[PDB]
Amino acid sequence: DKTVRWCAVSEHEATKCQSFRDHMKSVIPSDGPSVACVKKASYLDCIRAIAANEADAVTLDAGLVYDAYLAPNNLKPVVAEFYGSKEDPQTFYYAVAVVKKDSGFQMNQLRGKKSCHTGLGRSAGWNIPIGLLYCDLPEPRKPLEKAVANFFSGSCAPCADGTDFPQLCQLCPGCGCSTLNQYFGYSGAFKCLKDGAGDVAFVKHSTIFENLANKADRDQYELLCLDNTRKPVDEYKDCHLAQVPSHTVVARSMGGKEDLIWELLNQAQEHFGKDKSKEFQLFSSPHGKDLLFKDSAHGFLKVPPRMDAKMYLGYEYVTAIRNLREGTCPECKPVKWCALSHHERLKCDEWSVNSVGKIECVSAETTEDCIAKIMNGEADAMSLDGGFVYIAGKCGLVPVLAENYNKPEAGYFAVAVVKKSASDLTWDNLKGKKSCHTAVGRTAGWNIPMGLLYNKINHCRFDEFFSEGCAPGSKKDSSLCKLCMGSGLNLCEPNNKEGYYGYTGAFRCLVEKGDVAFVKHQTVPQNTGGKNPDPWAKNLNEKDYELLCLDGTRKPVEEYANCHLARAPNHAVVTRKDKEACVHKILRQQQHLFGSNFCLFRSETKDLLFRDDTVCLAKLHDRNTYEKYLGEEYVKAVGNLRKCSTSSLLEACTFRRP
Ligand SMILES: [Yb+3]
């Protein structure tokens, strides 16, 4: 059986589920998926059941998504309800903090202000902002209503205990827990702000648009961002307290059966979803409202499979709820650095102990795994090629420091290298030629050359432009894995175990099999004239190699400052905004101790943790966003390249922010 065991939490839900089960048998052939209904007492019992392999799937609110991730349940999100419409699906809401234009305070200055909450125990209006403010609340922080009452000067907090904590009901006396109270619910807490009762209103990204039809009125309001700046009310995507998923189907992390759940639901919506008019309706029931799924849903979207709970919920949300659940506060902290290999980890361990606990080391199998650890706070920083920066930025991380090479730089150089003998080659036409790339999605190897190349052919299907090639990171069955030299599983893998990976590897590829290699300006120099002693490079001479220039002409290798494709954003350190300052300070205190003269920018193997050309770590000034650092033309290009290129982390991050 390809049976899916759906978990109900009430008798009404179970009846619907039995009917779901029955009607599915009419539209699904007997090789396809079917439904079993497992009735439980509560969402938590459902969670345990799923984890105990006694059920397979249930649909949850965000807090419960959090519970289900925790050990020993270890469930994850697999399918998402969407709302709104087919065309612009609404999967998340944002919890925001709204304030009056010119009230002149920031998120770190809410102590002593007047607050408006939608209601005690609601998410956007209470659990999130109070969770984020948890550690700014005065001791003792239990009971929590008391500490909140001693934080804001007065408030409207519906359903709070005004008898014991009158400050919480000062702006809505009694704390009316119903619409009889004018300051209740979303519109209510917003009104409390609009009427001048209070200074901040903790609500959803959409409340203000629902209560103020004119842009001119809305310009009177702003949002508090967590970095302690402010933004317009329609920039909530970049200025919110948390991004919250509305309703999420969850399943086991291992043993799923995620594939099957999506097949079941995706066909359920096909035949019984919104506007389908059968007598069985997936998103309603005579037996009651919001059974199994919300009656307001318009369908399901499949959650990208790189996604775990902490990533889906988001850094901010998880911080808020962890604070409420654990209730643990501290009293600038060690920077957790992310290492990708045994050779990187070793350098880091020794860095760790040299700095006296000021640095610590976390490691992961791949760059994307390290990025995901930074995203969710398992780790704090790592240095990255411009192509990963783009990816990290799309995932909400920011660049804090550039690696420097000269003696605030315009960047290293991207060149196209060819063999001198094969003289027919020119930039103006490489169609049908063989190509070597450092890896797909990297600055020099891919984003620049293929960027430019995209503008000339207007599609990113390069395995059909070139004949064959080696471009580590491509789909193994592609023509751009044909020249690669890894064996077995390592073929075309974008790491060391594939010998044509990296700048050097891409040059090796040119030497042995290719017609053009896309590398940086110092790649050929450093792997010729005996400098590289490996058999393949040992006997080579840089005079036998030429660069392709954008005219159509060529030039000797060392004449690169006139024969490059484009300038290249330096590799850069990235982190979370909430650590930009501590990273920015800890590292400048570490490079003025181990920089240029244990050595930080020198390594045992080659280019570990930071590149070895790196003399110093630079300030970025204004250019501390991925788009302000990479620059408009880089991003415009990569945008075009995304159409054909995968990356599973980028698929996950853009599910959350398209
Ligand atoms: Yb690079």
UniProtKB/Swiss-Prot annotation:
<keyword id="KW-1015">Disulfide bond</keyword>
<dbReference type="GO" id="GO:0072562">
    <property type="term" value="C:blood microparticle"/>
</dbReference>
<dbReference type="GO" id="GO:0010008">
    <property type="term" value="C:endosome membrane"/>
</dbReference>
<dbReference type="GO" id="GO:0019899">
    <property type="term" value="F:enzyme binding"/>
</dbReference>
<feature type="disulfide bond">
    <location>
        <begin position="7"/>
        <end position="46"/>
    </location>
</feature>
<dbReference type="GO" id="GO:0005905">
    <property type="term" value="C:clathrin-coated pit"/>
</dbReference>
<comment type="similarity">
    <text>Belongs to the transferrin family.</text>
</comment>
<comment type="function">
    <text>(Microbial infection) Serves as an iron source for Neisseria species, which capture the protein and extract its iron for their own use.</text>
</comment>
<feature type="disulfide bond">
    <location>
        <begin position="338"/>
        <end position="370"/>
    </location>
</feature>
<feature type="disulfide bond">
    <location>
        <begin position="116"/>
        <end position="192"/>
    </location>
</feature>
<feature type="disulfide bond">
    <location>
        <begin position="135"/>
        <end position="329"/>
    </location>
</feature>
<dbReference type="GO" id="GO:0048260">
    <property type="term" value="P:positive regulation of receptor-mediated endocytosis"/>
</dbReference>
<feature type="modified residue" description="Phosphoserine; by FAM20C">
    <location>
        <position position="645"/>
    </location>
</feature>
<feature type="disulfide bond">
    <location>
        <begin position="348"/>
        <end position="361"/>
    </location>
</feature>
<dbReference type="GO" id="GO:0030669">
    <property type="term" value="C:clathrin-coated endocytic vesicle membrane"/>
</dbReference>
<feature type="glycosylation site" description="O-linked (GalNAc...) serine">
    <location>
        <position position="30"/>
    </location>
</feature>
<dbReference type="GO" id="GO:0044325">
    <property type="term" value="F:transmembrane transporter binding"/>
</dbReference>
<dbReference type="GO" id="GO:0005770">
    <property type="term" value="C:late endosome"/>
</dbReference>
<comment type="function">
    <text>Transferrins are iron binding transport proteins which can bind two Fe(3+) ions in association with the binding of an anion, usually bicarbonate. It is responsible for the transport of iron from sites of absorption and heme degradation to those of storage and utilization. Serum transferrin may also have a further role in stimulating cell proliferation.</text>
</comment>
<feature type="disulfide bond">
    <location>
        <begin position="436"/>
        <end position="509"/>
    </location>
</feature>
<dbReference type="GO" id="GO:0009925">
    <property type="term" value="C:basal plasma membrane"/>
</dbReference>
<comment type="subunit">
    <text>Monomer. Part of a complex composed of SLC40A1/ferroportin, TF/transferrin and HEPH/hephaestin that transfers iron from cells to transferrin.</text>
</comment>
<dbReference type="InterPro" id="IPR016357">
    <property type="entry name" value="Transferrin"/>
</dbReference>
<dbReference type="GO" id="GO:0008198">
    <property type="term" value="F:ferrous iron binding"/>
</dbReference>
<feature type="binding site">
    <location>
        <position position="124"/>
    </location>
    <ligand>
        <name>hydrogencarbonate 1</name>
    </ligand>
</feature>
<keyword id="KW-0964">Secreted</keyword>
<feature type="modified residue" description="Phosphoserine; by FAM20C">
    <location>
        <position position="363"/>
    </location>
</feature>
<feature type="binding site">
    <location>
        <position position="122"/>
    </location>
    <ligand>
        <name>hydrogencarbonate 1</name>
    </ligand>
</feature>
<feature type="disulfide bond">
    <location>
        <begin position="395"/>
        <end position="653"/>
    </location>
</feature>
<dbReference type="GO" id="GO:0006879">
    <property type="term" value="P:intracellular iron ion homeostasis"/>
</dbReference>
<feature type="binding site">
    <location>
        <position position="125"/>
    </location>
    <ligand>
        <name>hydrogencarbonate 1</name>
    </ligand>
</feature>
<feature type="glycosylation site" description="N-linked (GlcNAc...) asparagine; atypical; partial">
    <location>
        <position position="458"/>
    </location>
</feature>
<feature type="disulfide bond">
    <location>
        <begin position="159"/>
        <end position="177"/>
    </location>
</feature>
<feature type="disulfide bond">
    <location>
        <begin position="549"/>
        <end position="563"/>
    </location>
</feature>
<dbReference type="GO" id="GO:0016324">
    <property type="term" value="C:apical plasma membrane"/>
</dbReference>
<dbReference type="GO" id="GO:0005576">
    <property type="term" value="C:extracellular region"/>
</dbReference>
<dbReference type="GO" id="GO:0005788">
    <property type="term" value="C:endoplasmic reticulum lumen"/>
</dbReference>
<feature type="disulfide bond">
    <location>
        <begin position="332"/>
        <end position="582"/>
    </location>
</feature>
<dbReference type="GO" id="GO:0034756">
    <property type="term" value="P:regulation of iron ion transport"/>
</dbReference>
<dbReference type="GO" id="GO:0005886">
    <property type="term" value="C:plasma membrane"/>
</dbReference>
<dbReference type="GO" id="GO:0005615">
    <property type="term" value="C:extracellular space"/>
</dbReference>
<feature type="binding site">
    <location>
        <position position="186"/>
    </location>
    <ligand>
        <name>Fe(3+) 1</name>
    </ligand>
</feature>
